[PDB]
Structures are given as C-alpha cells and as structure tokens.
Design a protein around this nucleic acid. Structure first.
Lengths: 19, 105, 94, 99, 92, 205, 99, 80, 92, 103, 18
DNA sequence: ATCGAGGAAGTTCATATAAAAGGCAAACGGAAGCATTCTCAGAATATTCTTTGTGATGATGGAGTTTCACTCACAGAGCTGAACATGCCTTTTGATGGAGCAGTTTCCAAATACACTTTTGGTAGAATCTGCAGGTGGATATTTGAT
DNA sequence: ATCAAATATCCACCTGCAGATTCTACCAAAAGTGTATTTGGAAACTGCTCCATCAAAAGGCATGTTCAGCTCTGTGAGTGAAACTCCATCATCACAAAGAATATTCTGAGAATGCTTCCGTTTGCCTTTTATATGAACTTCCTCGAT
C-alpha cells in the first residue's frame, strides 16, 4: 500500500493566512 | 476457471455481495456492470486506511490485539477521518487526552 | 412536563427519588473526563435537566420504531436507527 | 498532608480508561419511567443490549457537551463552570445537537 | 443466517500487519462503519441518476459520489486507487 | 373520561381472534347493537378497532368497565394462563364477604382491583392488578382469582409479579370469614383438570 | 451635538429591511476566481440565478454567524467583538456548520 | 496585492454584523470575516462544480447550487 | 413544462383568507417548502418498508413517518387531521 | 366522473402525489390508502404556515404576502422552528432582535 | 382547528416544574 | 546532606476469557453460457442565454483626524466549593425458575399492478385586464435639543 | 424658557410593474372497468430471552466541617473605534451584437436483465487448540517528602 500525509488535527478553529 | 470476480479485480473485499446489495436496496432500476467493482475498491481503501493507523495504535501502546479504544485514537488523530466521521460516537470508546492550556503549572 | 399525573394516591409521588439515581459524584466523574477542572454547585441540578431532555429526543424516536412493527420489545437496532435519523450515528450494535 | 493533589491525579486517570460512569440500575429506572410517559399504560420491555446502547450515547454526548462547554469558561477568565456555561453552550450549538 | 463482512475485513488486516489480532467487538465496529460509508455512497449516487434523467447507476456515478462523500486529501488517493481496480477488471 | 383507556381498549380487542369477536361484544354488554350494525366487521382489522374506539369516545369510557372486557376475555382463554388452587379453613353466598372485597392498601386507591361480574357455580371473577403507594397500577400483568361461595377452594391465576403471593392470601382470608390459607400441589394449565382433582376429593368425602 | 446617535438608528434600519449587503460585481469576481482554482485551466460560465443563490446563502450564513458570535462577547463582560469571538464560534458548531 | 478579494469592501462587512446585533466591531474582524468567507466558498463551489462537471455541461445553473447546499446541510428555498 | 403546485396552494389560501394575495416569488418558496416536506416523508417512509422487509408503503407506514418528522404539538393534529382524510375516503 | 381529491374533502391533488410516489422508486408497490393520507399532511402544513403569514400580512399592513412575511411567520413559532431547522429563506431578513443590554 | 402558537420559544435555558 | 515512604515501573505467573485454527455441512449465492432486451452515447440542429464591450453616473467607499467611550491589570472583600474521614444503604452478581413475547410456518383473500379503455377536467401556458405597492409630495403633526 | 430643523404620520396622487382573469386547446394526466395476480394479515406454536426476587457483598455514596483558591466589584492608566468632512473611482444599468453553449430530435449497439447449471466460498458450530491480558503479587527500583 502507498502512503498519504495524515496530519494530527492541525488546529482549525483559528483561521489560517497563506503564511 | 478464474471466475471469482474479486480475484479478477485484484481486490479483497467481495464483488458479488456488493452487486446483490445494489438491487435489493432499490437504488436504481438497472445496475451497471463496471459499478460494483469500483465500490469494492473505495471500501477497501477506506478499510486499509483506518487499520493502518489502528495498527500503529496497538504497537505504540504495547498490545497486540486491536481493542475498540484503539480505533478512537486512530480516527480522531487523523485530520480527514474527523471530518468524514463527524457524526459518529464510537461505543466502548473514550476521548482524546486533551491537556488544556491553563492547566500548565 | 408532568403528565400521567403524580397525585393519584397522595402528594409527593417521588417516592424514593426516581430521578436522583444519577448520583452526585457521577455527574462529577462525567465532567472530569471533559476537562472540567472544578464544578460549581448548581451543575448537579443542571445536568439532570439536560439528561432528561436528551431521553425525550431519543425514546420518542425509539419507541416509535418499536410500536410500528407490532411488538412490546425495544431492540438494539431500534435505538441505533433512532439515533441515525437524529444525527448521532452509533457504531456499536448495528 | 492537607492537599497533596486533588484533581490532576483524577482527570488523567479517567481520560485514560474507557469505563461507564453512570451506574446501570439507576440509569435503567430513569429510562423506564420516561418510557412510560410516552405510549401510555403499557410499560415496555427492554433488551439488555439497548440499555448499553443509550449509555454509550448519553455518556458520549455529555462528555462532548462539558468539554465544549468548558471552552466558554476559559473565554471569560473563570476556571469553574456555571449554568451560564451550559445554557450558552446549547444555544450556540444550534438546535440539532442537543435540545 | 445474517451475513457480515467479517471474514473479508480480517484478510485486509493480515495484508497490512502480519500479526495484529482483532477483538470481537472491534469487528462489530468495522461492520457498522463499512455499512455507513456504503449507505452514504450508494444512497447519494441514487440521487444523481434521479436528477440527471437516467436510470442506471454506472461506474461513473460512483466516482462523483466518491468526490463528494469524502474530504480533500483522502479523495484524490481513493479515486486513483479506484479506477485502477476497474481497468484491470476490464482488460482481464 | 381518561386518556389511557384509549390505548388499553385498542390493545385489549386485538388479542381476540376474529372468530368470537361478535360473541364477546354481545356478551360484554357495553355498546348498543345498532352501532354493531354500523361497524362492518368484514373489512381490515386496522379500520375495525378505530371505529370501535370512535364509538367508545362518544361514551363514558371508564377504566373500571373497560377492565371488565379483559375479564370475560380470560373466561374464554382458560388454556393459556397457569392456575393455582388455594383453600381456606377455620370458620352461603358470602354476602358479608362481598360487602368489603377491597380491604387492602387504602393509601393507594379507593379500589385497585374493582370487578363486578358474577358467574354461576358460585364463581366470582375479580381482576387483580397491582401498584404501590406512589405509583399508578399496572394494567397489563393482572392476577385472576376464582373463588366459590360453597367450597373454600380458590382458583388463582399465576402471578407474573412476584413478592405478592402471601398478601394475596391475606387479602382474601381476612376479607372472608376465615383464618387459614395454604398452598397445595395443584399448579396446572387447565380448569377441567382442576375438576377431577378438586371437585372429586371435596364433594365426595 | 458631538454625536447624535450612530449605531442604534442604523441597526434597526437594517433589520427592518431585506437588502443584499455585498455589491454584486465584486461578489462575482470573488466567485469566478475560486472556481478557476479548481477544474484546472478551463474556466466556466455562471447563470445569473446562481450568483443570486450564493448571495442568499453567504449573506445568510455570515449574518447568522455574527449573531451567534456576538453572544460570546456578552459572556466575557465585553461589548466589542474580537477574533477570539469568531474563532470560538466556528468551534462549538462542530465541523458541519462552518469550517 | 491589488484586488480580487478586497471586493468584500470595508463597510460592507460592517453592515453585515449590524444585522446580527453587533454594536461595535473591533479592528481585525474586517480581516477575519474575509477569512471565513473564503473557506465558505471552497466548501460550496467544490460541491457545486462537481454536479456540473458530472452531467457533462459547462454551465453552473441555479439547480447546481441548491443541490450542493442540500447535501452540505443548508437547504435553500429560493430557486429549486 | 415543469409542473408546480401554484394553482393548488393558491386555492388553499382562499379557504383561510378571502382577500389575501401572494407575490410571484412567494409562490416559489411554497414550492420548495412542500417538496422538501414531501421528499423527506416518502424518502423516510421508504426506510421502514426496507427495515421490516415488506414492499408496500401503505397508509400505515406514512403515519409512523409523520410522528418522526414533526415536533411535539404539531404531531397530534397532523395525524388526527390525517386520519380524517382516510375515514371519509373508505366510507364513500 | 369523480375526482379522487373530492372524495377526501381536501384540496391538494391525490393523483399527482400518487403519480410521483411510484416514479421515484420509494417502494416497488404503493398502497391505495397512502397518497390520500399524505395529501392531508402536505396540506395541513401549508395551511398552517399561511395562516400565520396571513395574520402577519394585516399586522404589517400589506395585503399581499411578500417573502418577508414567510420569514417572520416561521421563526416566530416554537414548533415550526424545529421543522425548518437547517433551512434559510431567500430575500429573508431576520427577526427584529437587538436585550437593552447592548442598548 | 387551532393550536397554541408560542411566540418567544425560549428553549435553551432548562426550566423546571416551577 | 540525610533518609523515610510511597509511587512507579518492571517482572513473573497462573489463568480464564477470549480468540484462532479446523472442519464441513450445506444452505446459499456468485458464475458461465446463452437468449433476448433496451437505455444511452454520437451526431445534426434550432436557439436560449451569457459573456464582452460602452458610457453615463453618482451613490458610495478610502483616506484622514478625533474625541470619547471602551478593554485590561491590580488589589482587596467576601463566599464557596474541593479534600476528608466514616457509617451505611444501595448496586452489583448470580442464579433463579417462569414466561411473556419474538420468530417461524402455513394458508388465501382482499387489496394491487397491467392495460386499454373513454373521458375530461384539468393544469400549463398564452394575451388581456386590473390595482396594489413604492415613491413623491401634501409637507401638518410631534418630540428631539439649543437660547 | 421657544425657535428650531428633524423624526414621524397621514392624506392624496400616480404610475407601472406586477398579479389577476379569461380562455384557450389539448396535451397530458387521470378516472374507470376488468383481468389476473400476490403481498401480507391472521392464526398457531417453538423456545429464546428478560422481568422480578433473594443476598451476600462491598463498593460506593451521603453528611458535615473546614479552608485556600477562587469570583465579584471598583479604579484608573492607556487606548482603539465610531463619527464626519470631502471626493474620486469603481459598481451599475442599458444595450446589442456575437456566440459558445444548451436542449431536442433521432438512430443502433454494446450493455443489463433473465433463466439455467454446477461449483466454491462463506457461513454457523463446535471444537479443539492456543494465547494475551489482567489482575495479583512482587521486589527492586526510585521520586518525593519529612528531619
């Protein structure tokens, strides 16, 4: 089987800028 | 005599049981031939993706048999399996060990 | 509210407690899992309110599947189905 | 001594395990009373897999309510909860995830 | 008399881990997970053939049902492992 | 009228087979037979019972007299419930007995087990339900006692509710003019089998 | 006067009526840009009901986000909003009501 | 760094939150609501151009948005 | 050529208001209100006939679908006004 | 020479419901008494949200129901809220809501 | 017929029998 | 520093509980080959609808200065809710017979599709006929705040 | 204080887009009369499975008193946002031609349904065999607290 990139929840209630 | 359609597809989930369930559910009037080979792949890839993470749940907790707690630390510690199963509370489960911010000494 | 009225014999038909079986440290140990570092003295009345209005939005959906197919027994598949239409899908018993 | 440590031994204990937290026989006698206020007269009959099917939804709902209610205490400089912080945690929640 | 997917899932576990076992209640969750994804996909694929004035759930109308019922990064790897299982079934 | 009487009558009638459905209602003596002309029995039973509800909603629909419908139902299905034989001693139509049938548990209701339907061979039919001092009674696990005013034998249905076996004996012996009650070796399915074991040994001593 | 009244007369004017609150041609130039970052290279073509279909949802979701997010301002004794009050109100709805 | 997202103009976001009952807006919601709006339009137009590219057209119609918001969880009663 | 309920809903308004008019966009909302109640109820009554493994949506298996898709006090009238429709449909 | 709907007494078309409820494959066989009983519930709701809106037309003194008056008839009812929970309305507006606490 | 239409619908605050 | 006491891994160990190998009946379903059936891609074509351009245009937003109301840290008065220690009543287990009640099997008729029927009224859509709403002005009626 | 321009209302007008009204004709859908078919009510019975007790059994909860870490209120330095005078440029409406794109009509061929035969594969079922885990003891180790 291949691999994807699986990230730990990567806090998402805080809005992300491109930076 | 190579007549098992699962072995013809190179998959492991069955084909004919999916093709039987796509008519007894009344989802359409005619069911295509190429369709339930494509549904027996996506359910494999959604089964091999959980257990590869749940397989690393037992190894890092030093047990050898996956118990229903180990899925709860397998699904929620993904990004995308959270947003898939947003309405799912797994029985005999547990929650994530959330150390809060203002509990730090 | 309080239908099938209590005073068919006398007042105070709450005979032992009938609601206070959800004990004082049980609501504590629920909130201790969530990260509640300290519980104020009115949540012991509050959670008993919310848990009574969670059962009436399950059992009304759960006894109806039971009363439909003409039975007297609520099954495990009835509660799984009732929570599935509710919005809280359960993966235990299906 | 007086106060060795009260709670931080207990929270990291209870998040580690996966037990049930409300004892079964009171949790049955809460259901059978509420089951008889609907479908009047006939008290019904419960399979023993059904009571362990609410209790893995009730004690998974309230543990998601309190944690998501606790993020309102930290937003107001408190530490302790209040019934302000449960009444407000249902109104923001939006009428389909706990009423 | 009621059939599960339990023997099929147990083969997937041995394909990705040579020794990892599975408890019985854990096999119960792996059933009512994989019917929930099945009832979503084959339920939402019914709505497209009812929308677009057709009558046949084809091999194409599962593919636009995969790209909706899954989030972002898990989509593009599922569909690319999806159509590979159709091409070798065609030119068998 | 009440509201639980609608659910009780709707579930009482559906236990009866379609054969004797007109035998019961002519013998139950509660509704006018001109309404039975209106009730077309030759159609689906779903629409049969609702018209029977709707023709009881325009009347008093009391829980006392609706309980009597279950009593006649038990007289014609005596091959299902398991029966028991008691007998009293230490002391007729038992007229002074019927004066105070209900001398038990005064704080719960005025009458929990009220039943007025007498039967020949001096047979009384009393439907015994049960409840407690702060709970409403339960109308779907009854107890049936058939007592005769000549033989001190009492023909008692098996109680699906436990814990209340000797107090049923106390509520029947003290209310009668007796002092003793026993529990013999007679627990069978039928009543004609309770003829040749009770009426043979007692009436031909 | 220094200030007659600014905020109170403007708010009860706006809840009284039923406008749209974002001008259409910027809202078209926002939508077509996001559409071309998907479906690589090739553009598309929009009917003039679909751009009045998002604007009866986007200005129906942002207005329902702000009224819900404003109740976390009153819970902290403030009056003004902050991005502490929007980044908390996208959380408690729980992953299916604004992400 | 010129245009194409600042068309959601400076007092327009203000007049939005007036309807929700915001007395007084701070100085970062003018940037914050432009962040929410971009992550709202990527969870609609993904589901809306999917129905268009499926039934082989090139035009996103009115029914292509009412469906994709119905599968999202926000059923709209304007146009379907 | 697509049919609506616009002649029907306009007749309902006259039974409870002798003089109230309706704008031509408000009839559009009274389309997607009544299809959304319709596509729920028949799309949810199908699930009971698939559960108990029958194959006839009768006049009974809408009733237990009406008691789910409605809240508390709206339930008791809509079933009681519902059964008033069937009783004078059979006894005709 | 009798319409099916006039046998019930209601107004919504029995046959158009009975025509659609086979064409979607909701079940492989559709009973006779069903699309009468569905034609009542679909009318009792649409005769419920109009009478509130029709009594909202006079109180704001516009004799034609414009799509604002649906929005103020749905959200000003306890029981119609829970039915139309996850549903917005085009040309909607919100309830007049400020509290005093902000004012 | 007529039902009772309840105008505020204050629902989030739990309210006891008093 | 000095050293007592838990606290915590870390190890061993029997031990049921739960699970894996095995087996095979076998009831059931996937499969092949065939016969016949149609839905739907492919191509030609009228034609709805929408992009790209212009010029008026002015309501409306971007920049700036400001003044006051508002957010934030500190400190002190008051009160409230965790630790604690200890009887005891209450939840567990288990084992219990009884059994109400779920599940199965077997009949058959009263309700359902097929279908062509004739009807037909009924809805959708197309020009004509009204009138209700929004805006302007009639600006008079009325409470706002400065001399 | 009254003068004062706003804030608000009503009264009358006045298009002008917008619903409303016939009447269409007829297409499409529905309503009716039988033909022939069948799911599912309805009755009876096996036997799985759960209420209702008794009872050690202790594990866990109820009550009361304390106390230090909270919650609440006020002040004041410091500030970040509404308010307001201007002014341009960017959103809008109208149009019109240009057309890429949509929708309808029409044909046939590779694709799905359908019955049948014959195997393989998937079940429940023990069944034996096998193991991991967990709870216990267990000691040695070893952090942490009182002299």
């Amino acid at each position: 089987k291949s691999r994807r990139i699986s990230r730990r929840p990567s806090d998402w209630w805080v809005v992300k800028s491109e930076e | 005599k190579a007549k098992s359609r699962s072995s013809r597809a190179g998959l492991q989930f069955p084909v004919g049981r999916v093709h039987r369930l796509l008519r007894k559910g009344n989802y359409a009037e005619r069911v295509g031939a190429g369709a339930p080979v494509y549904l027996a792949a996506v359910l494999e890839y959604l089964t091999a993706e959980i257990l590869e993470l749940a397989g690393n749940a037992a190894r890092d907790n030093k047990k050898t048999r996956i118990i229903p707690r180990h899925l709860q630390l397998a699904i929620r510690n993904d990004e995308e399996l959270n947003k898939l199963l947003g309405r799912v509370t797994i029985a005999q489960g547990g929650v994530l060990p959330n150390i809060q911010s203002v509990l730090l000494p | 509210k309080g239908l099938g009225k209590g005073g068919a014999k006398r007042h105070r038909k709450v005979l032992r407690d009938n609601i206070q079986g959800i004990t004082k440290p049980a609501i504590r140990r629920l909130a201790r899992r969530g990260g509640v570092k300290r519980i104020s003295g009115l949540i012991y009345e509050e959670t008993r309110g919310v848990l009574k209005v969670f059962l009436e939005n399950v059992i009304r959906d759960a006894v109806t599947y039971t009363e439909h197919a003409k039975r007297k027994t609520v099954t495990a598949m009835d509660v799984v189905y009732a929570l599935k239409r509710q919005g809280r899908t359960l993966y235990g018993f299906g | 001594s007086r106060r060795r440590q009260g709670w931080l031994k207990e929270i990291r204990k209870l998040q580690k395990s996966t037990h049930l937290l409300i004892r079964k026989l009171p949790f049955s006698r809460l259901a059978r009373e509420i089951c008889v206020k609907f479908t009047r007269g006939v008290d019904f009959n419960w399979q023993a897999q059904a009571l362990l099917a609410l209790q893995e939804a009730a004690e998974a709902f309230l543990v998601h309510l309190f944690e998501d209610a606790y993020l309102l205490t930290l937003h107001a400089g408190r530490v302790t909860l209040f019934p302000k912080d449960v009444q407000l945690a249902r109104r923001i929640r939006g009428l389909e995830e706990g009423l | 008399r009621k059939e599960s997917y339990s023997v099929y899932v147990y083969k997937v576990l041995k394909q990705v881990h040579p020794d990892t076992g599975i408890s019985s209640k854990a096999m119960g969750i792996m059933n009512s997970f994989v019917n929930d994804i099945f009832e979503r996909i084959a339920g939402e694929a019914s709505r497209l053939a009812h929308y677009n004035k057709r009558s046949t759930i084809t091999s194409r109308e599962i593919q636009t049902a995969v790209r909706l019922l899954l989030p972002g990064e898990l989509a593009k790897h599922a569909v690319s492992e999806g159509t590979k299982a159709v091409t070798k079934y065609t030119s068998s | 009228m009440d509201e639980t009487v609608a659910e009780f009558i709707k579930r009482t009638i559906l236990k009866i087979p379609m054969n004797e459905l007109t035998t019961i209602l002519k013998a139950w003596d509660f509704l006018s037979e001109n309404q039975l002309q209106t009730v077309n029995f030759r159609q689906r039973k779903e629409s049969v019972v609702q018209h029977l509800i709707h023709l009881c909603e325009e009347k008093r629909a009391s829980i006392s007299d609706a309980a009597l419908l279950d009593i006649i139902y038990m007289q014609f299905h005596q091959h299902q419930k398991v029966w028991d034989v008691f007998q009293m001693s230490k002391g007729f139509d038992m007229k002074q007995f019927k004066n105070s049938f209900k001398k038990i548990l005064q704080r719960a209701l005025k009458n929990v087990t009220v039943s007025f339907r007498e039967t020949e061979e001096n047979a009384v039919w009393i439907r015994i339900a049960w409840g407690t001092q702060y709970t409403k009674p339960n109308q779907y696990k009854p107890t049936y006692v058939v007592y005769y005013s000549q033989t001190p034998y009492a023909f008692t249905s098996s109680s699906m509710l436990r814990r209340n076996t000797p107090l049923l004996g106390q509520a029947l012996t003290i209310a009668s003019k007796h002092h003793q009650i026993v529990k013999m070796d007679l627990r069978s399915r039928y009543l004609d089998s309770l003829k040749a074991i009770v009426f043979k040994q007692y009436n031909q001593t």
